[PDB]
Amino acid sequence: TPQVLDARVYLYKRIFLPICIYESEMHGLPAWLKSFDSDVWKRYRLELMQLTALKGAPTALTDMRKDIIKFSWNYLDDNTSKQAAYVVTAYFISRTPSELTTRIFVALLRCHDTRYLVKQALELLAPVLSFYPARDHFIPNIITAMGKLQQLAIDLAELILKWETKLPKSFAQREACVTFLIRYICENELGKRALNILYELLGVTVKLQFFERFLMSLLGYCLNALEVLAVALTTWIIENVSYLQKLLEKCLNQDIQEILQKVLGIILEAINKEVTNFISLIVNIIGEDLTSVAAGVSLCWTLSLYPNALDSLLPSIMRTFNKLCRDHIAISLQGNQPQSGDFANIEKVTTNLLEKILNLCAARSLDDQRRVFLSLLAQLIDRSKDMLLKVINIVTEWIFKTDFTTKEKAGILGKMMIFDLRPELSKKFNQVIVDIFESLAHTELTARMETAFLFGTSDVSIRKKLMSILSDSLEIDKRLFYIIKDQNWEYLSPWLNQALQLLYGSFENTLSPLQSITEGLAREKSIIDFVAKHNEFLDSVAGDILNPLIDI
Amino acid sequence: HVVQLDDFATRLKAQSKHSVLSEICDSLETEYFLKSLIPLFIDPENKLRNITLEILHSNEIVDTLMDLLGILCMKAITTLHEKVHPFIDIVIEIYKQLAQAMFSFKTLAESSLGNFIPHVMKVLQAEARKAAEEKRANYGEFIIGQVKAASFLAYLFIFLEPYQQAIPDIIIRLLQPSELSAARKELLHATRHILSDFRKMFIPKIDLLFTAYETLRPLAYSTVADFIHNVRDPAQLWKSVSIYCKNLALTVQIMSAKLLLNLIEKIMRSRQLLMVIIDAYTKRFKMLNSRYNGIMKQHATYELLKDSRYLFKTLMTFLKTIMIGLKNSTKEEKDLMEIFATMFIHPASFNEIVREELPFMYKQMLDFASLLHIPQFFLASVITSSSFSGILITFLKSKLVDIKSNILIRLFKLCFMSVESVILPHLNELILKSLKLSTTAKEPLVY
């Protein structure tokens, strides 16, 4: 068929495949001769499911028949598929040994262009990790050294020779020093897995191997030295070489973050268990080289590598990250050089004067930076001379928050953060009534800021309670649950707003809290008799709402 | 203190640089091999540096100078204090007829052009053609460096028988660097062949260069170059479509490029094309859909399904819709029924069921009322399992887009055999009675 019609090859192959597949799969030594002769003279579900879905008779007969049939009949895809599937299924499913070990070791070790070297080296060397110690441990030097003389031969020979030669030790100076120095002095998976597994599993040689290999060394040296030196973590060479190599090599895409985070975390954690160079270089490079890895690693390492450390150090990361991200993602201002003037502080008037002067002098997507900067600066600067900070903070927060889509976020964030860190009725009632009646952050911010600010403190209570209860109840669970729980809990410890708004607005699962808490607290804690008796008796007319009315 | 800023600023702000910087920094600054030798290479030298450093001595560290900087052969002496002195003398003695004559005569009688042509060619005709056309490591290094530098400089600064016929001998003879040969051969062959024998000249590179870049770049490069060059101007269609379609994250690019290039090239030009395209597309879609459905169902039920389900559904729906719409102007029933039932029985249900179920009636149309209808009702009704979108979408779209075989076989088999399992009688009787009674047709003989 190669010299050319589809009905003859398709009908002959499809119509003729049922005799060999049905006869070979239903007639049962026959799998090796039928699969090797039928597959090599020119089906995966029956051979893979029947051979993988199936005690010394099975292992000895299958290993002796498969090893004798494969070794006796193999002298291109049949050897790699049968050897890889049988060795992978038997070695992976096996987790009498003299015949299989002596026959497989003597036949595989005595029976020895990319398919033959890769299939023979990978298939013959992959089963060595699953009287025999001398031939098995000594056959890797002559087989690997004689067969290794292009990345498959060096990777399979170096990984199989280093793993097979180093796994039996749990004459080693020449193999360990030559294999570690030759394999580590020279595609990232072979060098990283072989160098990391051999260097991490292999352990006078540490000073010469670590000093010569670490000092004789751009991605292979930093990745192999950082991964091998950090996976198994004299401190000045590792800390200075790891910090200088990671900061200098990463300061010029997962290799920079993984090598810089692993080398910085392993070097700082392993060396922190001379401080001016590591603290100044690590703080300046880590604070100047800059989503959860940077904030978590920089905040945890900078805040944990120093009670006043977190509050006094949160302003540098918050002001540097917010000022660098806001000044670098938009610019068009005059606050781009705040890292050199604000980051020069890692060596009660010093905290208030430096924080108020640096924040007020350097502060001259906006909801996260304004709310995080105002809440973090106000909470951190106020949680640690009071007339200047209180008058400047109250005048700047009230004038800046009251002098301003941006009115709801600026007024709610500035009023809620400034009022909770220690003309809103027209904008909040008109914007909430028009935005809520003309149809997610407006309901939670307006309901949380209006309910917390209005409930956490004579016409303002009747106008705000009547307008907010009538406008919010005349039209969603946060306003009714927060207003009913805050008004009932704050008022159960004025009766016309709670009785008229609750009785006139409560008329399904959230209505049991007001009637149960109001009826139980009002009836058990004893103009209130008419509203309580009329609202409870008229609203209680199901076992909890009728058991207290008839039993109380 | 002042040695770093004074030596780095004075030595970096401005041979004479090695002797002045090493002599002034070493003589004025009195571990220095890496700092003093890394600055000379990070930004008559071997004779003055080796003679002055070796005669004014500080031994093995001098060998590090060999990693920094006609006169370089003396540097080989630094490796002493036919295999440790012939590389610097033979490689530096001949350091444009001088490059082709000296490199061809010296290399044939027993890397400078690729590393030196990039600086002069990138920092700003006879050397590229003479050096690239006049060219065991000397053939691979000179051919790879001259072919890569000439192909990259000539192709980036804006004939194929020598590079294509000579790349297989040096690559096959030396392999017993894929980005430069694959990008230069694909860009030069596609641009030279499309800006104006492709199976014989292109089958050696894909058949001899194999290993994911060579096997994955041949589908888009051979399909785009062969489709654009062959379509922009009988053995090329059968050999390229049979070898490219039979030789196959590479499944989406190989299946989309091979199906789009084979369907557009075979349909843009007659029962042989429709029968061969329908048999090859039905066999490949049935084998890929059965293998992906069986492996995904066994691996997912025995305990990356979005890429296999989206790629298999988009490739099967796009290939079946493109082949049916482009080709409609015993293996078909088993391949179409097994691929549609096996691939469809495992907002995506309406588009996948409508697009995957419209190919039976749309691709069939004429005839196909017994084998195409008996396998769908028998295979779809003999499996049951847990399905409701394929029966209502396939029965409503197939019965409403034309129906007597599904209502007669489903009503007779379900009503005669029915005497979780009771949900097929109500849905089958309601869907068959509503579709057959609301279809407004004759037939009758059923009430």
Produce the secondary structure layout.
The structure is cut from a larger assembly and holds 2 copies of chain A.
Chain A: H1 6-26, H2 30-40, H3 44-52, H4 56-73, H5 77-93, H6 97-110, H7 114-125, H8 132-147, H9 151-166, H10 172-184, H11 188-201, H12 205-215, H13 219-231, H14 235-250, H15 254-271, H16 275-288, H17 292-304, H18 308-328, H19 338-342, H20 349-362, H21 366-382, H22 386-402, H23 406-420, H24 424-437, H25 441-455, H26 459-473, H27 477-491, H28 495-505, H29 511-524, H30 528-539, H31 543-551
Compact summary:
Chain B: It comes from Komagataella phaffii (strain ATCC 76273 / CBS 7435 / CECT 11047 / NRRL Y-11430 / Wegner 21-1). The structure is cut from a larger assembly and holds two copies of chain A. The first copy, chain A, has 552 residues and is an all-alpha fold.
Work out the helicity level of chain A: over 70%
- First CA to last CA of chain A: what distance? 97 Å
Q: Major beta sheet of chain A, specifics?
A: none
- Count of separate DSSP helical elements of chain A: 31
Which two protein chains have the largest interface (Cβ within 8 Å of the partner's Cβ), and how many residues from each? A-B, 11 and 11 residues
Total strands of chain A: 0
Task: Give the class of chain A from helix and strand content and strand pairing.
Answer: mainly alpha
Shape of chain A: extended
Our estimate of the beta-strand percent of chain A is: under 5%
Please identify the oligomeric state.
Answer: part of a larger assembly
How big is the Rg of chain A?
38 Å
PDB class: transcription
Keywords: yeast, Tra1, saga, activator target, transcription
Entry title: Structure of Tra1 subunit within the chromatin modifying complex SAGA
Chains A, B: Tra1 subunit within the chromatin modifying complex SAGA
